[PDB]
From Swiss-Prot, chain A:
Modification after translation, per record: Phosphorylated by CDC28, which is required for the early mitotic activity of the APC/C in its CDC20-bound form.
Record's miscellaneous remark: Present with 593 molecules/cell in log phase SD medium.
Organism, scientific name: Saccharomyces cerevisiae (strain ATCC 204508 / S288c)
Sections of the chain in a coiled coil: none
Protein name according to UniProt: Anaphase-promoting complex subunit CDC27
Localization (cell): Cytoplasm; Nucleus
Biological role: Component of the anaphase promoting complex/cyclosome (APC/C), a cell cycle-regulated E3 ubiquitin-protein ligase complex that controls progression through mitosis and the G1 phase of the cell cycle. The APC/C is thought to confer substrate specificity and, in the presence of ubiquitin-conjugating E2 enzymes, it catalyzes the formation of protein-ubiquitin conjugates that are subsequently degraded by the 26S proteasome.
From Swiss-Prot, chain B:
Name of this protein: Anaphase-promoting complex subunit CDC16
Gene name linked to the record: CDC16
Record note on quaternary structure: The APC/C is composed of at least 13 subunits that stay tightly associated throughout the cell cycle: APC1, APC2, APC4, APC5, APC9, APC11, CDC16, CDC23, CDC26, CDC27, DOC1, MND2 and SWM1. Interacts with AMA1.
Function: Component of the anaphase promoting complex/cyclosome (APC/C), a cell cycle-regulated E3 ubiquitin-protein ligase complex that controls progression through mitosis and the G1 phase of the cell cycle. The APC/C is thought to confer substrate specificity and, in the presence of ubiquitin-conjugating E2 enzymes, it catalyzes the formation of protein-ubiquitin conjugates that are subsequently degraded by the 26S proteasome.
Upper classification of the organism: Eukaryota, Fungi, Dikarya, Ascomycota, Saccharomycotina
PTM description: Phosphorylated by CDC28, which is required for the early mitotic activity of the APC/C in its CDC20-bound form.
Family the UniProt entry places it in: Belongs to the APC6/CDC16 family.
Subcellular location: Nucleus
Other facts: Present with 2753 molecules/cell in log phase SD medium.
Repeat region (TPR), residues: 1-27, 33-65, 70-99
Domain of life: Eukaryota
UniProtKB/Swiss-Prot annotation, chain C:
Similarity annotation: Belongs to the APC10 family.
Protein name according to UniProt: Anaphase-promoting complex subunit DOC1
Gene3D superfamilies: Galactose-binding domain-like (2.60.120.260)
Gene that this polypeptide is encoded by: DOC1
Main subcellular localisation: cytoplasm
GO biological process, one term: cell division
Organism: Saccharomyces cerevisiae (strain ATCC 204508 / S288c) (Baker's yeast)
From Swiss-Prot, chain D:
Main location: nucleus
Full protein segment contained here: 1 to 35 of 124
Subunit annotation: The APC/C is composed of at least 13 subunits that stay tightly associated throughout the cell cycle: APC1, APC2, APC4, APC5, APC9, APC11, CDC16, CDC23, CDC26, CDC27, DOC1, MND2 and SWM1. CDC26 is required to tether the essential subunits APC9, CDC27 and CDC16 to the complex.
Organism, as annotated: Saccharomyces cerevisiae (strain ATCC 204508 / S288c)
GO biological process, one term: anaphase-promoting complex-dependent catabolic process
UniProt protein name: Anaphase-promoting complex subunit CDC26
Gene from which the chain derives: CDC26
């Protein structure tokens, strides 16, 4: 299955999304129990345009592994793309509970809070993000100005 | 005679002459690059005769006597993909790719076999 | 319809306003001591004693990152290059390697030529050159003329660049040729370095780049 | 005497292309049937 995953990634980086998906389904078939393979297959599917099937595969992945940071990250990104922020809120809440020391989680959590409209939550999370890391603070500064 | 009747698009008599050739050489000398040609040509006639089982058997036998043969593995992939034995088809095709990476038809064959397997 | 499309193809009286061009070749100012909005657009590293070479390397890397930070496509490796002459020490690879330490050097006639041949019609938008006045004063490029064309046959003058003190990346976007597109559409670009600073002989080229628009298992 | 090496049949490109094509319409057959 490592060769199948590599073929899928090699097809993915060149833009042949359908060929990459063809490789990823075989990689999943070889080893049904996986998380990163399922996430990559769902990403390929949403690249094709099948958002519902990608959601179903992601749900199967999270059911198989209830503790998977990357699967929840992709859940949140897809729900943000699909304007499903009502459940995306709890997805990022659980994610930031899982990872407390990563500034990227705070950034996305504060951004989602601002999109919902909780100004206090947005400013608190963005302040935490500036305190944790100044490397990506340029986007954080703009997020403050827009929220304020 | 079998090869030339094959080339003349008259397969039925080519098979009988090649069958006679196989039965003459069957008892003696399995090795020495003669029986190899006999089974390969006979298997080719079956694959062109549209009867596949004995062709697969003969190709398996000659493969047992000689493993480094890209054409043999390509023919095995052909015959296995003609039937629905996709796993043997892809295995023998990957073996052919391993023996010779730059095969023209083999790449398209692998693509088609993989697509059929995924859709299955 | 036939007559009107010919008129659109060949506007006789519509185009020519007065026919009073001045015809002198326009000159671009490259100095980095004056702060202006237009110069900041074309000069990236920012206006500033002479920095030490390690500071030059640092600011070289930061300029590369800043230029690549924006939404861009790099096609520097998607074209054929043929300089006027080598010197057998360093080909143009060290010019295109995005490394300050390594560089390309020509050796031959005084009007040095650098040829950029394209394979397909690519619309270049930002032209990037790195200069080092203090690090390479002997071989510093003092006078630059950038040409344009669809072929070696129809190469024509586009712009002038006079160098006084530029120790950093230089961004050169093109707007005079096409105001609507704000980019250049050619297949043939050649550069000339007819003279160097303090009456130099040869010329290096620290950096060069071309800009166009458009977790795992081991 | 020097016996000639017997000639060996070769798997041509044309017949394998014909078979791969036939397989493509073969898989294309039931995809609309499934729909």
């Amino acid at each position: 299955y490592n060769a199948y995953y590599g073929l899928g990634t090699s097809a993915m980086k060149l833009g042949q999304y359908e060929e990459a998906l063809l490789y990823f389904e075989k990689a999943r078939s070889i080893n049904p129990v996986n998380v990163v393979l399922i996430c990559c297959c769902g990403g390929s599917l949403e690249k094709l345009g099948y958002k519902e099937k990608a959601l179903q595969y992601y749900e199967l992945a999270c059911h198989l592994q209830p503790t998977s940071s990357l699967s929840k990250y992709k859940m949140g990104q897809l729900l943000y793309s699909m304007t499903r922020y009502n459940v995306a809120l709890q997805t990022f809440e659980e994610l930031v509970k899982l990872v407390p020391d990563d500034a990227t989680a705070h950034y996305l959590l504060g951004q989602t809070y601002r999109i919902v409209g909780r100004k206090k939550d947005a400013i608190k999370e963005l302040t935490v993000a500036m305190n944790l890391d100044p490397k990506g603070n340029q986007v954080i500064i703009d997020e403050l100005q827009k929220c304020h | 005679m079998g090869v030339m009747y094959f080339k003349k698009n008259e397969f039925v008599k080519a098979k009988k002459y090649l069958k006679k050739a196989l039965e003459v050489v069957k008892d003696l000398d399995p090795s020495s690059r003669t029986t190899i040609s006999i089974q390969l040509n006979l298997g080719h006639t079956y694959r062109k005769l549209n009867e596949n089982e004995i062709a697969i058997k003969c190709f398996r036998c000659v493969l047992e006597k000689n493993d480094k043969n890209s054409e043999i593995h390509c023919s095995l992939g052909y015959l296995y993909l003609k039937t629905k034995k996709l796993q043997k088809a892809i295995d023998h095709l990957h073996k052919s790719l391993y023996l010779k990476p730059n095969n023209s038809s083999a790449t398209a064959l692998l693509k088609n076999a993989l697509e059929l397997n995924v859709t299955l | 319809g036939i007559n009107k499309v010919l008129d659109h193809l060949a506007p006789s009286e519509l185009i020519k306003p007065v026919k009073s061009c001045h015809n002198k070749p326009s000159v671009l100012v490259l100095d980095d001591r004056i702060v202006d909005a237009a110069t900041k657009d074309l000069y990236v590293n920012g206006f500033q004693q002479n920095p030490t070479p390690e500071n030059l390397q640092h600011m070289f890397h930061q300029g590369i990152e800043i230029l690549d930070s924006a939404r861009m496509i790099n096609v520097t490796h998607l074209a054929l290059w043929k300089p006027s002459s080598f010197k057998l020490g360093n080909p143009v690879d060290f010019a295109l390697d995005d490394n300050y330490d390594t560089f390309w050097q020509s050796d031959g006639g005084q009007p040095h030529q650098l040829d950029i041949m394209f394979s397909k019609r690519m619309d270049i938008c930002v032209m990037a050159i790195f200069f080092s006045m203090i690090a390479d004063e002997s071989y510093a490029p003092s006078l630059v003329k950038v040409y344009a064309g669809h072929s070696p046959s129809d190469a024509r003058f586009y712009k002038m660049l006079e160098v006084r003190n530029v120790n950093g990346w230089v961004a050169l976007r093109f707007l005079d040729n096409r105001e609507d597109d704000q980019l250049l559409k050619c297949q043939f670009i050649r550069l000339l370095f007819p003279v160097n600073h303090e009456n130099g002989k040869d010329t290096h080229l620290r950096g060069i780049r071309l800009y166009v628009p458009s977790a795992i298992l081991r | 005497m020097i016996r000639r090496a017997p000639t060996t049949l070769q798997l041509s490109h044309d017949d394998v292309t014909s078979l791969i094509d036939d397989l493509n319409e073969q898989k294309l057959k039931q995809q609309l049937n499934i729909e």
